[PDB]
Amino acid sequence: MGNKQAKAPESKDSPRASLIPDATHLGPQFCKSCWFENKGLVECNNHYLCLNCLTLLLSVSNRCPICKMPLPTKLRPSAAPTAPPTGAADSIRPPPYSP
Ligand SMILES: [Zn+2]
Ligand SMILES: [Zn+2]
């Protein structure tokens, strides 16, 4: 008869299952908002914007419009150059005798 292995790849160009068939959640390394360039590209969490246009609209002065998500929370500075100990065990209220 002629037994041979056959190949059958699936184009899957337009699938009708899974609403987000895309498996990308980071973004390409090319800024598509202001223009194509790699001089100062910065990768947002789920979005890509370069510093050149990022400064004009700020990274997130109020909200990132491309991420389509609000961020009212803030990130702590994670720094503490000053942190002396305190306790004030000695009670204070009356004036000093001052001999
Ligand atoms: Zn840009
Ligand atoms: Zn963003």
Query: Treating each run of at least 4 consecutive H or I residues as one helix, how many helices?
Result: 1
Morphology:
elongated
Radius of gyration: 30 Å
SS-derived structural category: little secondary structure
Beta fraction: 5-15%
Percent helix? under 10%
Terminal Cα span: 121 Å
The CATH topology of one domain comes to Double Stranded RNA Binding Domain
DSSP, total strands = 4
Largest sheet, in brief, is: 2 strands, antiparallel
What is the strand arrangement across the widest sheet? 1-2
PDB class: transcription
Keywords: ring, negative regulator of eIF4E, transcription
Assembly: monomeric
Entry title: NMR assignment of the arenaviral protein Z from Lassa fever virus
Key features?
99 residues; little secondary structure; Double Stranded RNA Binding Domain; two-stranded antiparallel ribbon; 4 strands; elongated; binds zinc ion; viral budding; Z_RING-type_Znf_sf; RING_finger_Z_arenaviridae
